[PDB]
Paper text:
Hence, amongst the four monomers that form the asymmetric unit, substitution of the sugar occurred in the four monomers of PA-IIL S23A/Me-α-Fuc and G24N/Me-α-Man, but only in three monomers of the S22A/Me-α-Man and S22A/Me-α-Fuc complexes and in only two monomers of G24N/Me-α-Fuc. In case of serine at position 22, the hydroxyl group of the serine side chain is able to make a hydrogen bond with the carboxyl group of Asp96. When this serine is mutated to alanine, the hydroxyl group at 22 is absent and the side chain of Asp96 interacts with a water molecule. Previous work regarding the comparison of PA-IIL and RS-IIL has hinted that the reason behind the different affinities may be in the composition of the specificity binding loop. These observations are further confirmed by the results of the current experiments that point to a very special role for Ser22. In the absence of the side-chain hydroxyl group (mutant S22A), there is no hydrogen bond to Asp96 and the available carboxyl group of Asp96 binds a water molecule. This is in accordance with the observed entropy penalty. The S22A mutant displays a significant drop to a mere 11% of the PA-IIL affinity, its dissociation constant being consequently almost ten fold higher (3.96μM). Overall, the S22A mutant can be described as both fucose- and mannose- binding.
The present study is devoted to the PA-IIL lectin from Pseudomonas aeruginosa, an opportunistic human pathogen capable of causing lethal complications in cystic fibrosis patients. The lectin may play an important role in the process of virulence, recognizing specific saccharide structures and subsequently allowing the bacteria to adhere to the host cells. It displays high values of affinity towards monosaccharides, especially fucose – a feature caused by unusual binding mode, where two calcium ions participate in the interaction with saccharide. Briefly, the structure is tetrameric with each monomer characterized by a binding site containing two calcium ions and a saccharide.
Numbering used by the authors:
A (entry chain B), B (entry chain A), C (entry chain C), D (entry chain D): 1 to 114
Write the structure that this text describes.
Amino acid sequence: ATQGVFTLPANTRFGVTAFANASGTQTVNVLVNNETAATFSGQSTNNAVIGTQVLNSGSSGKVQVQVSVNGRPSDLVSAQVILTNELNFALVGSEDGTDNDYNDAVVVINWPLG
Amino acid sequence: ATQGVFTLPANTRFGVTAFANASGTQTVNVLVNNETAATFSGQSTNNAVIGTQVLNSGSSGKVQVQVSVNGRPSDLVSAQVILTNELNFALVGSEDGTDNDYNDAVVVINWPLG
Amino acid sequence: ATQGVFTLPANTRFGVTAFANASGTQTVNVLVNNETAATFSGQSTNNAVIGTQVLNSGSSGKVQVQVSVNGRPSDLVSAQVILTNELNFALVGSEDGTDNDYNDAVVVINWPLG
Amino acid sequence: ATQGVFTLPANTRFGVTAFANASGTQTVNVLVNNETAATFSGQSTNNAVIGTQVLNSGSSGKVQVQVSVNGRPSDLVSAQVILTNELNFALVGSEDGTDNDYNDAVVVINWPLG
Ligand SMILES: CO[C@@H]1O[C@@H](C)[C@@H](O)[C@@H](O)[C@@H]1O
Ligand SMILES: CO[C@@H]1O[C@@H](C)[C@@H](O)[C@@H](O)[C@@H]1O
Ligand SMILES: CO[C@@H]1O[C@@H](C)[C@@H](O)[C@@H](O)[C@@H]1O
Ligand SMILES: C[C@@H]1O[C@@H](O)[C@@H](O)[C@H](O)[C@@H]1O
Ligand SMILES: [Ca+2]
Ligand SMILES: [Ca+2]
Ligand SMILES: [Ca+2]
Ligand SMILES: [Ca+2]
Ligand SMILES: [Ca+2]
Ligand SMILES: [Ca+2]
Ligand SMILES: [Ca+2]
Ligand SMILES: [Ca+2]
């Protein structure tokens, strides 16, 4: 099934944070309404925060995470969890290889902020 | 119910990252086997990362997050989610005041790394 | 934090299903817009499905789960998970005693249906 | 990503319950250590319970859920959620058609019991 695609409340600020855990350079692209809004790149096998940014969900609320390693798309997993009916996390894992740890790039989206 | 307490696989490296969304300084303590292993503090109303670190779960695997603001422990909410039976997230939200947004300090624990 | 309260899409059918795992008779009450819409009850230490029902979330979409044992309110834990941005589960555990297994009555809410 | 595969604690009872929301008969197979341990069949567009059972996770703790409709394997989505470090839910959705509602057979696994 489609993964790494979330519908947020419209015109709402959210945080997006990417972590790396692989030998190869991870490229994370965050798209809002089908247009790239942040990009982070880096290599780490120690969960380096390769980028964090505050974005606005815009008119559509559509947020999509894509991950690649030197041009090759990684396979994604994702889900959303809501705590106390108020606190939202959208979670992405990605796999660039064969070991299926799905941690090669890890992306966490959180809202609301402030 | 108890919140902010997670059993990790023993002797496993994990990532812990905290964000702030509140007027007051957040202090985040991360305990491993009931001893403080990391402490983060900072202030942001824009989801700033107030700390990130890699720790080991130790012999017991017992990890606990506690949050203090303005001299008092915040009310916690938490859950653990596992994606594709491989990728683990331990998620914590906290409330230091009256509005119940639960985002005042947000803590993300992830494993495995590497 | 408040637990057992979920905001569902307005005017939308959902399934609610309750399981029992305790020596005492569980009573599960499902409130829609602050009014009892369903009540399930039974006694099992083997996950008996003490009730299942389809309800409509109504104009507000507010849904609350309350559990009691021998006329005493059980402590609740809850969260909502969303799969592939489309499939929703609202999850409730409850504790009636001292062992903190939180499985004494378990309630699963699922939408959409059809 | 592989979906509908869960590692449970070894030799532990768990509940498995399946619901149907589709025009076609859903067949749900539950495998423990790669051997079929339960099979549920049924048809409903109203979230009817097509089966419920308690099974033992065995020496491996490997549990896999498979869903088919008239012999055709359904695409799965899944996750595991743990509340208060105690109560576990393994959640599965499936899609047999083109509408991607992923509720055609919904499977809920829960543990511990008792
Ligand atoms: C070559 O494999 C890549 O790098 C390794 C060090 C591991 O992080 C593995 O998960 C990843 O897919
Ligand atoms: C008396 O304690 C109650 O019954 C027992 C059989 C257990 O299921 C326990 O979790 C429950 O709280
Ligand atoms: C033919 O399509 C199947 O039956 C319909 C009644 C819907 O439940 C749909 O989601 C399902 O895939
Ligand atoms: C700016 C405000 O600061 C504190 O009062 C928080 O509890 C609120 O949620 C908000 O972040
Ligand atoms: Ca990998
Ligand atoms: Ca890796
Ligand atoms: Ca607050
Ligand atoms: Ca706040
Ligand atoms: Ca109990
Ligand atoms: Ca019990
Ligand atoms: Ca369908
Ligand atoms: Ca359907």
